[PDB]
Amino acid sequence: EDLGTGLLEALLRGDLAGAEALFRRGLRFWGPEGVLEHLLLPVLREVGEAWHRGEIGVAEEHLASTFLRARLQELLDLAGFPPGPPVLVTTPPGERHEIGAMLAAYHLRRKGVPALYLGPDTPLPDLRALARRLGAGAVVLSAVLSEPLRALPDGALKDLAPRVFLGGQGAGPEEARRLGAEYMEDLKGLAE
Ligand code: B12
């Protein structure tokens, strides 16, 4: 069954219980890895398109995204967590597109990297506090809009953790240099 349209429609009409039944069916079909890329991400992108066509209000959108993000954490929670200093993954303050981040987190988790997906738009002061408190080995940011990066002062990301990586269609070597992070175009950041 195309659970995509089903999960989609169940989320657009607020049927959360029903959405969980469809997500669970998708999980049994492709397992975690697949349900993410095949069901979760696509439906999330859909939910986002809908709001970008006025065909959806804010409360409905955030309700859909809250569910999708929760299913993501359950998928991540499924497997153990590898040893090593945690890697915090989020998006820059002001950035609400998180699919890039979700993929980075998942890809890293699939390669044995202890990635902790924090969800999007985390305030620098908090991210820094959390990176320090946990002994995070690295911080990974996904930028889809350039403004959020262009809004930060020089070297704003330098102090976050031992290593800071930036990627996404709104990041580039230039903004990374300016901010104190390492730029990376493809997800093969697995090696670091
Ligand atoms: C979904 C979406 C939303 C959703 C997202 C929800 C969510 N939680 O994710 C929502 C509804 C919330 C949203 C909001 C906005 N967005 Co929007 N929307 C989109 C849409 C449809 C897709 C973006 C997306 O999810 N992209 C996914 C990227 C994330 O994934 P990817 O492609 O696969 O990326 C790859 C690489 O980038 C890389 N990568 C990514 N990250 C990283 C990190 C590292 C370290 C590495 C190595 C690699 C890497 O790997 C990925 C490959 O797998 C586009 C339309 C479009 N044009 O595509 C916009 C778009 C991004 N949204 C857009 C805008 C402007 C907005 C809003 C500000 C709308 C508005 N105009 O008011 C709002 C934000 C609300 C606000 N006031 O703050 C514009 C952006 C303008 C610009 N280019 O500068 C777009 C382009 C729309 C358009 N066509 O005009 N949006």
From TrEMBL:
Residues annotated to bind cob(II)alamin 8: 49, 52, 97, 142, 146, 169
Keyword tags: DNA-binding, Plasmid, Transcription, Transcription regulation
Binding site residues for cob(II)alamin 13: 95, 97, 142, 169
Domain of life (superkingdom): Bacteria
Molecular functions (GO terms): cobalamin binding; DNA binding; DNA-binding transcription factor activity; identical protein binding; metal ion binding
Residues noted as binding cob(II)alamin 4 in the record, renumbered to the chain: 45, 52, 97-98, 142
Binding positions for cob(II)alamin 1 per the UniProt entry: 37, 45, 48, 52, 94, 96-98, 142, 169
Positions annotated to bind cob(II)alamin 11: 52, 97-98, 142, 169
Amino acids binding cob(II)alamin 7: 45, 97, 142, 169
Binding annotation for cob(II)alamin 2: 94, 96-98, 142, 169
Protein name (Swiss-Prot/TrEMBL): Probable transcriptional regulator
Natural source organism: Thermus thermophilus (strain ATCC BAA-163 / DSM 7039 / HB27)
Chain sites annotated for binding cob(II)alamin 10: 61, 97, 169
